[PDB]
Amino acid sequence: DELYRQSLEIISRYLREQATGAKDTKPMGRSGATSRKALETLRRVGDGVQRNHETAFQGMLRKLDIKNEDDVKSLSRVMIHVFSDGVTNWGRIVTLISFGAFVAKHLKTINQESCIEPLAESITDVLVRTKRDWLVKQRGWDGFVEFFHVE
Amino acid sequence: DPKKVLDKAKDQAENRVRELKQVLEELYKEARKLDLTQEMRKKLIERYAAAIIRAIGDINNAIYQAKQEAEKLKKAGLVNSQQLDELLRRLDELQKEASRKANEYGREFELKLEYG
């Protein structure tokens, strides 16, 4: 399943980088190209939504109260509610991922770093399993990179 | 022309923020009336987080949709590269001015849950 493999890599890595502060140096699937460009995009845009909505996000993180791994299953319910009006766009998508990064930073500060991969598997699983055809029609992560590109 | 791009973005943002407010109002009106089990509180907090993520996602999407609309006009030389920059600046201003409303309502609701 290529799209799942590629989506997990990107999401998983962004969450780890964000939690730690240290950028991976391991080799992706794409040496020079799509997974790399997607990660670069996600850093620019997703770092932006975190700065610009720090207040809203802290508020949510405090009340969802993500102590442990049971509570990580409750982010899925959040994602499903988000999409439940029928609308799917990249804005919604990047914002979920950026909220995922915000909670990954938080888990690291409570020494629940081992819940970061499950969190990322879980964002990916919702996104791909429920919007697969939409993602493919948008040209996948190539479309993501194109939609947010600024030059 | 550039004004219709920016005007569109402005409508989208305004409506998305209006929608966010309505949703959080309706949510409070049900949280107050009901006797909240631990479960029903958990559900209500999940709906609030979703409402916020939805609004922030749609604003963001409106703004970068307008970035695409502007970037297209430039390849159809229908805007000179200064007019492009007045647009990308007023979009950036719009983004900030909508992000501040999302944060405001997020917190207002957050206090209604602790205190109100």
Numbering used by the authors:
A (entry chain A): 172 to 322
B (entry chain B): 2 to 117
Question: What does the published report state?
Answer:
Pro-survival homologs (six in humans: Bcl-2, Bcl-xL, Bcl-w, Mcl-1, Bfl-1 and Bcl-B) are structurally similar, but oppose apoptosis by binding and inhibiting Bak and Bax, as well as sequestering pro-apoptotic BH3-only proteins (BOPs). Interactions between BCL2 members are mediated by an amphipathic, helical BH3 motif that recognizes a conserved hydrophobic cleft present in the effectors and pro-survival proteins. Here we describe the computational design and experimental characterization of specific, high affinity protein inhibitors for all six pro-survival BCL2 homologs. As confirmed by biochemical analyses and X-ray crystal structures, the designed proteins engage the BH3-binding grooves of their specific target pro-survival BCL2 family members.
One design, M-CDP04 (subsequently called αMCL1, or anti-Mcl-1), was highly specific for Mcl-1 and bound with picomolar affinity. The crystal structure of the αMCL1•Mcl-1 complex at 2.75 Å resolution reveals how high affinity and specificity were achieved. When Mcl-1 in the design model is superimposed on Mcl-1 in the crystal structure, αMCL1 crystal and design models closely align, highlighting the accuracy of our design calculations (2.1 Å average RMSD among the six separate complexes observed in the asymmetric unit; the N-terminal end of αMCL1 in the crystal structure lying slightly closer to Mcl-1 than in the design). Though the design model does not place αMCL1 near enough to Mcl-1 to make these interactions, the design calculations selected residues with long-range electrostatic complementarity. The BH3-mimetic helix 2 of αMCL1 has three additional helix turns beyond h0 and h4 that have side chains close enough to interact with Mcl-1. These extra contacts, combined with those made by the peripheral helices, expand the classic BH3 interface by 534 Å2. (C) αMCL1 computationally designed residues E111, R108 and N104 complement nearby Mcl-1 residues. (D) αMCL1 residue 46 was redesigned from glutamate (BINDI scaffold) to isoleucine to accommodate the hydrophobic Mcl-1 binding pocket. (E) Designed residues R42, K43 and K44 promote long-range electrostatic complementarity to the negatively-charged loop region of Mcl-1. αMCL1 residue E47 (borrowed from Bim) makes ionic interactions with Mcl-1 residues S245 and R248. (F) Designed residues K68, Q69, and E72, and Bim residue N62, make polar interactions with the Mcl-1 backbone.
